[PDB]
Amino acid sequence: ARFCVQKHSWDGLRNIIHGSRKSSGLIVSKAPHDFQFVQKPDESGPHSHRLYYLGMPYGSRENSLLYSEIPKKVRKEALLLLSWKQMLDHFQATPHHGVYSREEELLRERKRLGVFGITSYDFHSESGLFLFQASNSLFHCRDGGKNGFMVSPMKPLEIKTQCSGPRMDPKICPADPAFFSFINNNDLWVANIETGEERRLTFCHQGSASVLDNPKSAGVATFVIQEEFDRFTGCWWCPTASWLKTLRILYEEVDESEVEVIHVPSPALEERKTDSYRYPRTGSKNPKIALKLAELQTDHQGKIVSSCEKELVQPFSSLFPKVEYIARAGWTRDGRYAWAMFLDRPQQRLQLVLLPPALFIPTLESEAQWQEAARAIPKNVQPFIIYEEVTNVWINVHDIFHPFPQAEGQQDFCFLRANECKTGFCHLYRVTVDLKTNDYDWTEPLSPAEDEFKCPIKEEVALTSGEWEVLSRHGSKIWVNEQTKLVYFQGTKDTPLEHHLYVVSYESAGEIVRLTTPGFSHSCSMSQNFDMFVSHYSSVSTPPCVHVYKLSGPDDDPLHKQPRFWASMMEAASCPPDYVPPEIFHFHTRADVQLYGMIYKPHTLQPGRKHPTVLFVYGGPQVQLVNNSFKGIKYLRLNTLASLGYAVVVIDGRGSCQRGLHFEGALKNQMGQVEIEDQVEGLQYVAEKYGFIDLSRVAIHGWSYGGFLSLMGLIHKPQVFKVAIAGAPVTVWMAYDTGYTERYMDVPENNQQGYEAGSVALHVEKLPNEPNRLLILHGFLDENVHFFHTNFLVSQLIRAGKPYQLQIYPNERHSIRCRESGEHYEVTLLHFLQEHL
Amino acid sequence: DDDFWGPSGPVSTEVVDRERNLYRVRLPMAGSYHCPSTGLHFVVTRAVTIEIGFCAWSQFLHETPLQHSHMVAGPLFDIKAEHGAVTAVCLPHFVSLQEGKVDSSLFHVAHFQDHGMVLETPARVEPHFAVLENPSFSPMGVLLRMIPAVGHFIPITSITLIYYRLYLEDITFHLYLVPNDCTIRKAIDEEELKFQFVRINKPPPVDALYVGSRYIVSSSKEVEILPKELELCYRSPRESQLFSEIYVGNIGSGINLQLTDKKYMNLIWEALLKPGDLR
Amino acid sequence: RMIPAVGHFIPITSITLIYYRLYLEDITFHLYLVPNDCTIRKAIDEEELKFQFVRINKPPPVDALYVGSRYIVSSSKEVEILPKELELCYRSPRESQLFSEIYVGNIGSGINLQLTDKKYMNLIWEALLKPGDL
């Protein structure tokens, strides 16, 4: 009755994988990136907008800056497919042979950029100035405003310098586009573009070129912040110039003296040398942080006359105790305040704080002069904790925050805020708060209480509500139009499997209006004028397409402006030759909880049959595997698995994202113990609904959390899973960083019971005695989850005698990048199932 | 014939510039003409100087992301005339339809501009062309959706080209197998000419071949054959096209060149070439 | 935490250009392995024409090769290859253009020329050079 997979040779498997990748259907390899819309005067030509973005038009394997003219009065019956015009004439932006310096390659690994060339850029609208980093250094060009829009590509101008290392993180000053800033050799620098002069404002890094001896850093994000909170900057420009022209820059200075150091092999294997990282493991000490200003004054010709740098009149750690992280920070649009978001250590109390620039005084070591600065501060200057969010599960960190430029109402301060711990779901709120003052005496030090600078709420109006949530992470934002009192956002109001665009009046919280067509998942970006928007969407059965829409309608009622399809920038492909799109389903558990999923039913199926199955699994938080998007290019190996006769079952059990807090809050302090029961419950269900599932031959397979879950299944459910192929697993939980483990697992001092039963390396005696029931894969250069985790597991297997197999990827970090390591990963994957399942 | 075929009489087709194949003919009256060498058809109401020019798809496509969703379906022409001169135009396309395997709605006509490209729907699809009423003079060609370069194995009314070189009691054969396009044929003939490789005409495959399908070239007389398996794929006339080199060195009057599918070993095309048929 | 992304790679088309020069009876061949493009041929044609070299048309590889592969140039022993390997990779047009030269005294009955995959030993190309092409 059963069905036995065909046996192939090793070269045969290599050939079928090479063929399945050749038949991919000529993917674009990149969709148009972040856009910018620039209006044009109508008398200048037939077009009305110019649209700038990033992409690779299949020509080169190099992401590049492109633009397109948005026509005027396009005719309806015929589809218009906009061009992709080059903007930099024959300028390659990847380094020679595609090898990056260690700083920028580590940053690319932190951002997961798998493309070469210009990855991001900074753009000043008024001057129309483009500034970016390409090859090994900074470049800039001008197309927008006074220069007049271009027709032919033009040459980018290299910014000459005298620094040694690489110039990181360029940022154009909004108040004046003649200057910019950057990070060099772990310190901060400000430079001019016209006069070519530079200046250094921070003196923290010795430059001794040894991570061990120079721990301090200024205006740069540490590791745990980059990885587990997704903030890739440490400096921020003040958007207004104060009156000589004075400019401000808020930045942070980190002190990593007491952070534990570890060694990681380097991409140069022959040297047999390692690189050291400040890696704070769970329970250890995080670095010391602080916030500092850095003024600088210029004259009419653009010369930096003075350049000071100030600090809080009290030690940062004194005004704000129980503060472990700086999630986000920035200014308001008038320049009257600088704000930041503080997280405590258990990650259960986030709070917005508002800081006036007047609280920053120059660094005066002479105690006599310092007591003069602490005397000259105005009375109404003090920190303002506008908002505080306390939960019982954990605080997910949002970027969504939009303060309104206040008129001469000295008491009030109104802003939107996507709060999530109030109802259990991420919803927008319009909150107005009165900035109460106390007229502190900064000369005498103060030990702040729990409610020192907390200002009382005047109103708190929910704008959205229901059993759904507003997209707030992974680069999702909101667009607020203050001429019509609206707010555009993205959420899952329709169904948890789709991302749609919405709009609602933030003055009167009326009815929400969807702006995208149902049946797809949309990733869209508005215009700054709120008349056009581009949407990138797809579905399970359709590859992505990128259309541009134009909001038309009567000007008196702006809420109901109808979205008109204007033009297209990319069409679907449908991947016809060998791709059967999976089928989404959903079931209930015995605890009455709805879960979703998908199944790749085997090709060439026959009734009264049974196929070997492969329960693909990630299971970890902040990841949703089942949604109505095109999985055809991301996970196509699962289609190849199905093409041979395997039945792939994906299931997003309790713990995943996009379903609220109380749903995700099932992992708290029980990580590992609960996610498998949802996988086996959702695997036995498919045995009822469908009949081709052979529960005798059940595999399991994951990566970096599913690798951890692959091992937990084989321990807890040895009779359900025959084999188990773990990938870059997390074996011991006491050797992972603070930003992630403490969020969910509550440092071992408190959860030593759960750390024991969650670490899979401490239960090695329950693994199978029989051979050929465990494969292990890990990358050698991995710095996210180090090779130690696999290395310590193998050590525990030998102390008990259990068999295993192992595959190491020497030139691969946490993500398989080169194709030869990708092919060899899949070729060896099929071969294990072919023989031992 | 190369001249436009009309009821009154074939109009003399004068070439302006052979380095770009600029032709220009005078429609002497109203009515409906056609040219088979290009596969074009025209329906006009006056006597008008029409200007026909060839141009490669690639140089207009280098900016647009078209080529990953719609596949090139025919030769891309360039038409010039007065506005109220041409009523109907019929653009050729090599896509096979006779079995109805592919739908008759997925076709489109290209209309290039500085903005981008406009993708019109033909007024009528026919087993060898697409109809367009009242055209706006631009570079125009036929497009087919579904990116069938690897998918849908859409039938292609392909053709086969044979080129030869004698060189003192020897013979060497260049065998091209391409989609049906006048631009590709012309580019191949040009590039072969500067090598003294002259063409010889032979009936094409009378069946609908498939995209990306392998085709083993062989013969009865055992000779030298360089690429055993050709492909049936599309590549712009400005590039170089695959073919097969055959050192036939004929010692017998009839050499039966032949090609065979690789998937099902079915025989498709055969042609026996004799001496004397050359110069 | 995000699931690691396996990279996607597609092979590309390519051509192989054969050039020759005859001094008295010795032949110097110039073999070019280059991705199939337009500008590169009409550039390399002039670059070789400067040194009185000329082209000889031979079919390109049918298979789609990956960018970054290495290929052993093999023949029958009567040839001399100063570079024994070729490399398929994009190249800036205004910059230098790599090739492999071959020295042979007298061709006579024609010489074989083969490219072979370094990693798997695949015969992905061939050419039976004869004096007729000269």
Nearest Cα to Cα of residue B53 among B141, B117, B159: B141
- The shortest C-alpha distance from B81 to chain C (Å) reads 31
3-class secondary-structure state, position A10: helix
Instruction: Supply φ then ψ for residue B199, to 5 degrees.
Output: -85, 155
Burial class (CB in 10 A: 0-12, 13-18, 19+), A103: middle
Q: Under a CB-based contact definition with an 8 Å cutoff, are residues A273 and A252 in contact?
A: no
- Specify the amino acid at residue B10: P
Conformation bin of residue B106: beta by default, left when phi > 0, alpha when psi is -120 to 50: alpha
Nearest Cα to Cα of residue A783 among A185, A120, A226: A226
Establish if B83 touches chain A: CB-CB under 8 angstroms: no
Distance CA A212, CA A215 (A): 7
Establish if B61 touches chain A: CB-CB under 8 angstroms: no
Q: Which of these is catalytic: A539, A710, A782, A786?
A: A782
CB contact under 8 A, B238 and C38: yes
What chain A residue is nearest to C63 in terms of C-alpha separation? Answer: A22
CB contact under 8 A, A83 and B116: yes
3-class secondary-structure state, position A661: helix
Instruction: Supply φ then ψ for residue A410, to 5 degrees.
Output: -70, -25
Nearest Cα to Cα of residue B89 among B37, B121, B132, B138: B132
Q: Under a CB-based contact definition with an 8 Å cutoff, are residues A291 and A337 in contact?
A: no
* Residues in CB range of A309: below 8 A, 6 or more apart: A201, A202, A292, A293, A294, A295, A362, A363
User: Long-range contacts: A378-383, Cβ < 8 Å, 24+?
Assistant: A379/A437, A379/A439, A380/A437, A380/A439, A381/A356, A382/A356, A382/A437, A382/A438, A382/A439, A382/A440, A382/A453, A383/A319, A383/A353, A383/A354, A383/A355, A383/A359, A383/A453
Tokens at A413, concatenated? 């301060």
The strand pair at A542-552 and A562-570 is best described as antiparallel
CB contact under 8 A, C6 and A822: yes
Q: Which chains lie within 8 Å of chain B at 3 or more CB pairs, if any?
A: A, C
The Cα angle at residue A537 between residues A682 and A620, in degrees rounded to 5:
35
- Specify the amino acid at residue A339: W
CB contact under 8 A, B242 and C126: no
| CA distance readout (Å), A259 to A103, A207, A324, A482 | 20, 19, 13, 45
* Residues in CB range of B222: below 8 A, 6 or more apart: none
Locate the DSSP E strands across chain C: 14-22, 27-35, 54-56, 70-75, 80-81, 85-87, 100-104, 111-117, 127-129
Q: Which residues of C touch A637 (CB under 8 A)?
A: 6
Distance CA A535, CA A550 (A): 11
Q: Which residues of A touch B138 (CB under 8 A)?
A: none
The Cα angle at residue A752 between residues A749 and A754, in degrees rounded to 5:
135
DSSP 8-state assignment for residue A719: T
* Residues in CB range of A819: below 8 A, 6 or more apart: C7, C9, C66
Q: Is residue A814 annotated as part of the catalytic site, yes or no? A: yes
Distance CA C34, CA B241 (A): 14
Distance CA A120, CA A104 (A): 12
Q: Which of these is catalytic: A68, A523, A704, A710?
A: A704
| CA distance readout (Å), A400 to A324, A473, A475, A479, A486 | 21, 8, 10, 10, 15
What chain C residue is nearest to A815 in terms of C-alpha separation? Answer: C4
Establish if A633 touches chain C: CB-CB under 8 angstroms: yes
Q: CB count, 10 Å around CB of B31?
A: 13
Q: Under a CB-based contact definition with an 8 Å cutoff, are residues A39 and A19 in contact?
A: no
Establish if B116 touches chain A: CB-CB under 8 angstroms: yes
Instruction: Supply φ then ψ for residue A589, to 5 degrees.
Output: -105, 175
* Packing angle of the helix pair A819-836, A10-22 (nearest 10 deg): 130
- The shortest C-alpha distance from A193 to chain B (Å) reads 32
CB contact under 8 A, A704 and C1: yes
Locate the DSSP E strands across A436-541: 457-462, 479-481, 486-491, 500-505, 513-514, 521-526, 532-539
- Specify the amino acid at residue A294: A
CB contact under 8 A, A816 and C9: no
Nearest Cα to Cα of residue A487 among A438, A571, A566, A417: A417
3-class secondary-structure state, position B246: strand
CB contact under 8 A, B170 and C15: no
- Which H helix or E strand runs over A67? strand A64-70
Nearest Cα to Cα of residue A32 among A2, A52, A17, A59: A52
Establish if A822 touches chain C: CB-CB under 8 angstroms: yes
CB contact under 8 A, B227 and C41: no
- Specify the amino acid at residue A270: E
Q: Look-up: residue for tokens 């071949």?
A: B209
Burial class (CB in 10 A: 0-12, 13-18, 19+), B183: buried
Q: CB count, 10 Å around CB of A686?
A: 22
Distance CA A668, CA A621 (A): 11
Burial class (CB in 10 A: 0-12, 13-18, 19+), B37: middle
Q: Which CATH class is domain A34-570?
A: mainly beta
Interface test with B, best of C38, C42, C55, C123 (most B CBs within 10 A): C38
Establish if A46 touches chain B: CB-CB under 8 angstroms: yes
Establish if B64 touches chain A: CB-CB under 8 angstroms: yes
Q: Is residue A242 annotated as part of the catalytic site, yes or no? A: no
**Which of B192, B224, B235 lies closest to C128 in CB terms?**
B224
Q: Under a CB-based contact definition with an 8 Å cutoff, are residues B165 and B184 in contact?
A: no
Locate the DSSP E strands across A301-392: 304-306, 310-312, 325-331, 338-343, 349-355, 360-362, 384-390
What chain C residue is nearest to A817 in terms of C-alpha separation? Answer: C7
Distance CA A474, CA A499 (A): 13
- Specify the amino acid at residue C33: L
- Specify the amino acid at residue A39: Q
DSSP 8-state assignment for residue A762: G
Establish if C24 touches chain A: CB-CB under 8 angstroms: no
- Which H helix or E strand runs over A739? helix A738-745
Distance CA A568, CA A560 (A): 23
Q: Is residue A704 annotated as part of the catalytic site, yes or no? A: yes
Distance CA A742, CA A750 (A): 10
Residue B78 CB-half CA count within 13 A: 14
Nearest Cα to Cα of residue A802 among A755, A749, A766, A752: A766
Tokens at A581, concatenated? 């799109």
Distance CA A557, CA A505 (A): 11
Establish if A21 touches chain C: CB-CB under 8 angstroms: yes
What chain B residue is nearest to A85 in terms of C-alpha separation? Answer: B63
Distance CA C26, CA B165 (A): 24
Establish if A84 touches chain B: CB-CB under 8 angstroms: yes
What's the sign of the alpha-carbon dihedral B180, B183, B186, B190? negative
3-class secondary-structure state, position A587: strand
3-class secondary-structure state, position A88: strand
**Which of A59, A80, A570 lies closest to B118 in CB terms?**
A80
Q: Look-up: residue for tokens 């260049």?
A: B174
Question: Which residues partner with A360 through β-bridges?
Answer: A312
- Specify the amino acid at residue A819: R
- Which H helix or E strand runs over A641? helix A637-644
Tokens at A285, concatenated? 């000490």
